Amino acid sequence: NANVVVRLLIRRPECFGPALRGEGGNGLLAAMEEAIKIAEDPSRDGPS
């Protein structure tokens, strides 16, 4: 199951999100810091 899932995920790289996708996607650390900032700042975390 692990091998099959890894193969499918690498066949479809969009599953990793905006980051980790490449071609302009930032690193995992940058994505996590950006998400922390988004959570801290309203009007980007909630609906408003």
């Binding site: 690498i10 066949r11 790289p13 490449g22 071609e23 302009g24």
Partner: protein, 345 residues
């Protein structure tokens, strides 16, 4: 009928590229000497510039199955889909491989396709997969079919990348369809029997002359002109010409009488051509425009006007043979018959 690729045929990997909303045909090439990385040569405008099939060409060497592959790395066959094939560069002698280096522009998981000397390792081995539903896994591969090549070591595909300003070939997880065209087969009728894409010397007299260019003093314009010389130039490399057929597919076929072709000076790299006011002259690759660089061999100097024959897709009959057969070089367009100025080394 339907011919099949075999473990000794000479083939070219071709891809279709549509940029500026215009489809172009590009062939994988690799210099090998001084540059391991592979690139693409556009063969669409063969009438405007010559393609360098000499480095664009490859040869199939092995078609063994994957089980035997991993087995014997743990210790005229026919291509079948799913087999592990070995592609050897005809000129350099190295083998197509998936380099571990990652030069690809922000592709991360993609690699670079190049040439490697050692056959050992799964990197040089590629697996053929059907392009569409016409073919089936395990079925033998046929001439003219489209292929998907999968690297064993990296499990990526030979991918044509448009991401950079130029088109690149990289081993990525996106797949591009490659059309395989044959140049030469394993028959190779006897010896002699002039074959397209051959390096040869054109000797005028009783093995006492050679068509060469002035090269003792160097100089670009000195190399530019063409003359006849006798002596050790018959052994030097300045008297070597490649006979390039005007077609891409089956360019390694036997050359027949009346077949147009181009003559390229091997050392200088420029193509011999006619300009009526200044007789023969070499010129650059860019300027070779068929009408001026197209020559042909005639058995008899009489104006038979045989015209154009049907382009057979295969080895063909072996008309012109080396040494014994006498040939007359005739310009395809003007119809002139070479000759020497007989100026009184």
């Amino acid at each position: 009928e339907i011919q099949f690729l075999r473990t000794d045929d000479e083939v070219v990997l071709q891809c279709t590229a549509t940029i500026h909303k215009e489809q172009q045909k590009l062939c994988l090439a690799a210099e090998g000497f001084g540059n391991r990385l592979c690139f693409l040569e556009s063969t669409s405008n063969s009438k405007n510039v010559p393609p360098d099939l000499s480095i664009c060409t490859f040869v199939l060497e092995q078609s063994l199955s994957v089980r035997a592959l991993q087995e014997m790395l743990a210790n005229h066959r026919t291509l079948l889909y799913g087999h592990a094939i070995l592609l050897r560069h005809s000129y350099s002698g190295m083998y197509l491989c998936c380099l571990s280096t990652s030069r690809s522009s922000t592709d991360k998981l993609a690699f670079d396709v190049g040439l490697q000397e050692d056959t050992t390792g799964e990197a040089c081995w590629w697996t053929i997969h059907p392009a569409s539903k016409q073919r089936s896994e395990g079925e033998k591969v046929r001439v003219g079919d489209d292929l998907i090549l999968v690297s064993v070591s990296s499990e990526r595909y030979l991918h044509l990348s448009y991401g950079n300003g130029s088109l690149h070939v990289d081993a990525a997880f996106q797949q591009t369809l490659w059309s395989v065209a044959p140049i030469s087969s394993g028959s190779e009728a006897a010896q002699g029997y002039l074959i397209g894409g051959d390096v040869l010397r054109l000797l005028h007299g009783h093995m006492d002359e050679c068509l060469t260019v002035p090269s003792g003093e160097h100089g670009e314009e000195q190399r530019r002109t063409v003359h006849y010389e006798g002596g050790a130039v018959s052994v030097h490399a300045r008297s070597l010409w490649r006979l390039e057929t005007l077609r891409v597919a089956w360019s390694g076929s036997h050359i027949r009488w009346g077949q147009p072709f181009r003559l390229r000076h091997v050392t200088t790299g420029k193509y011999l051509s006619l300009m009526e006011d200044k007789n023969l002259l070499l010129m650059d690759k860019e300027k070779a425009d068929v009408k001026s660089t197209a020559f042909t061999f005639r058995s008899s100097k009489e104006k038979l006007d045989v015209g154009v024959r049907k382009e057979v897709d295969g080895m063909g009959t072996s008309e012109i043979k080396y040494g014994d057969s006498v040939c007359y070089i005739q310009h395809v367009d003007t119809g002139l018959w070479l000759t020497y100025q007989s100026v009184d080394s």
